[PDB]
């Protein structure tokens, strides 16, 4: 779906496409015959463009010519601008050269040498126009002040590749996990040659770490129990600025204030929310079941591994319901953004700091699990 639609989108050429699409804004100078042309042209395309430009809000009619050059550059392709082709030749040569000329002229306009209507000299000047343009001298001077004086290229306008293939840069971000995966593997092969050669504290000193990692698994469980702000909720209307700092449950707003705004709409999503609280608490309740049998192991250190293998059942069944619970709320939070969150919608839509900390809660449930069965080997 990506590579098709990226190649299905054609760059527009005719101005009939601007009367056909509406994603890219377009306007002229706020005064001049170029603005007046669409006002005057009775062709239904050129009138519909004038129908759009009088309804284009905000003002596509810029005040200066370089403002329309900038508004193309500032809106980054989503603003089109209409100026004369010979100036569109020149500014495309003027650096940074991030603009270009597409399509042909919409009408026929001509620069003419003007003299006193009737002045004798008017005729040999007029014959000189028919002589210099005939010989290609004016075409040679057109090569001078637009290509010999043009900063960007002289034949480099056709040097870009049109319809090329997949890029190596898309394949280049996987190289640092390829080469870095090899360089990290070179450290393991060098130390294990020494672990074959250099070498009750083994099965107990690692099992007490499984109790110690479950303690951190309980602490970061309660860290996302009150997220300080789940998202920087931004409605920065340049109205005024709005910077919501909404928690996981308490949608605080910020000068400082805090509110709940819990249990949003709709009711079938509330049925997910009444099931989400079931998924959140059964994580933490089955953590405590994992602690209680590991506190019986401290009595053995003062059945045995049979109850310790029974504790490794519920520490996994804690986090799998937490892997439900981490996917309950974020799918809920994807749904509430699809509601257009009632007054607190984020343009800085970015998950909370404790939710990255709550990622560490589940992996400490399972790093405790990979070593409590290492003592099960004996």
């Amino acid at each position: 779906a990506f590579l098709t639609v990226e190649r299905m989108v054609s760059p527009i050429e005719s101005a009939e496409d601007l009367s056909k699409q509406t994603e890219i804004a377009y306007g002229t100078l706020d005064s001049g015959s170029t603005k007046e042309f669409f006002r005057r042209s009775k062709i239904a395309v050129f009138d519909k463009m004038w129908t759009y430009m009088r309804s284009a809000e905000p003002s596509v009619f810029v005040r200066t010519t370089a403002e329309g050059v900038a508004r193309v550059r500032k809106s980054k392709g989503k603003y089109a601008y209409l100026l004369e082709s010979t100036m569109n030749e020149y500014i495309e040569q003027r650096k940074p050269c991030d603009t270009m000329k597409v399509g042909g002229n919409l009408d026929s306009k001509g620069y003419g040498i003007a003299t006193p209507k009737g002045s004798s000299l008017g005729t040999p000047v007029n014959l000189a126009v028919l002589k210099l343009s005939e010989q290609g001298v004016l075409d040679k001077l057109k090569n001078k002040w637009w290509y010999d004086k043009g900063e960007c290229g002289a034949k480099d306008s056709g040097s870009k590749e049109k319809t090329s293939a997949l890029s190596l840069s898309n394949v280049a971000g996987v190289f640092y996990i390829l080469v870095g995966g090899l360089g990290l593997a070179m450290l393991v092969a060098l130390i294990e040659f020494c672990y074959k050669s250099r070498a009750k504290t083994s099965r107990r000193g690692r099992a007490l770490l499984a109790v110690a990692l479950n303690l951190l698994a309980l602490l970061f469980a309660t860290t996302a129990f009150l997220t300080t702000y789940w998202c920087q909720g931004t409605q920065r209307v340049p109205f005024q600025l709005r910077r919501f700092h909404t928690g996981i449950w308490y949608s605080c707003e910020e000068g400082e204030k805090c509110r709940s705004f819990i249990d949003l709409a709709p009711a079938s999503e509330k049925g997910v929310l009444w099931l989400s609280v079931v998924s959140e608490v059964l994580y933490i309740l089955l953590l405590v079941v994992g602690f209680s049998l590991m506190c019986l192991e401290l009595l053995h250190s003062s059945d045995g591994l049979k109850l310790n293998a029974f504790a490794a059942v519920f520490t996994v069944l804690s986090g799998l319901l937490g892997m439900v619970a981490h996917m309950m709320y974020t799918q809920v939070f994807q749904v509430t953004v699809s509601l257009g969150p009632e007054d607190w919608r984020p343009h800085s839509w970015d998950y909370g700091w404790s939710f990255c900390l709550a990622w560490g809660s589940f992996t400490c449930c399972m790093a405790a699990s990979v070593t409590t069965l290492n003592s099960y080997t004996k």
């Binding site: 050429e13 569109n88 603009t99 620069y111 040498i113 003007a114 006193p116 007029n126 000189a128």
Partner: protein
């Protein structure tokens, strides 16, 4: 009128004098018109910065056209788009540079 690349200022325009102070596309043509018609030329920038529009209240041509109507200027070599009402007061030559409304958009990004 000062138009890039039609009439531009020099980098040593303070050091140069008169017609040499002005560079651009119209300057190279005005030498060739002097090569064709045989005359000394004086390149002069219009004061108001107008191209020779017509006022609607006073009905007085400003810009370069009013310098040709009121006898202030002798000839105009400039980016002057030919309309009907401009020909109603002064005389154009043939259109040496045909053009029209082009579509300036951005260039596809190297991202």
């Amino acid at each position: 009128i000062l138009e890039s690349p039609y009439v531009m200022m020099k980098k040593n325009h303070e050091m140069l004098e008169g017609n040499e102070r002005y560079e651009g596309y119209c300057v190279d043509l005005a030498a060739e018109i002097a090569k064709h018609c045989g005359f000394k030329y004086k390149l002069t920038i219009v004061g108001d910065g107008k191209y020779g529009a017509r006022d609607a209240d006073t009905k007085i041509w400003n810009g370069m056209v009013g310098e040709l109507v009121y006898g202030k200027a002798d000839i105009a070599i400039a980016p002057l788009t030919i309309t009907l009402v401009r020909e109603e007061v002064i005389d154009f030559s043939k259109p040496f540079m045909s053009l029209g409304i082009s579509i300036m958009i951005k260039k596809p990004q190297k991202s």
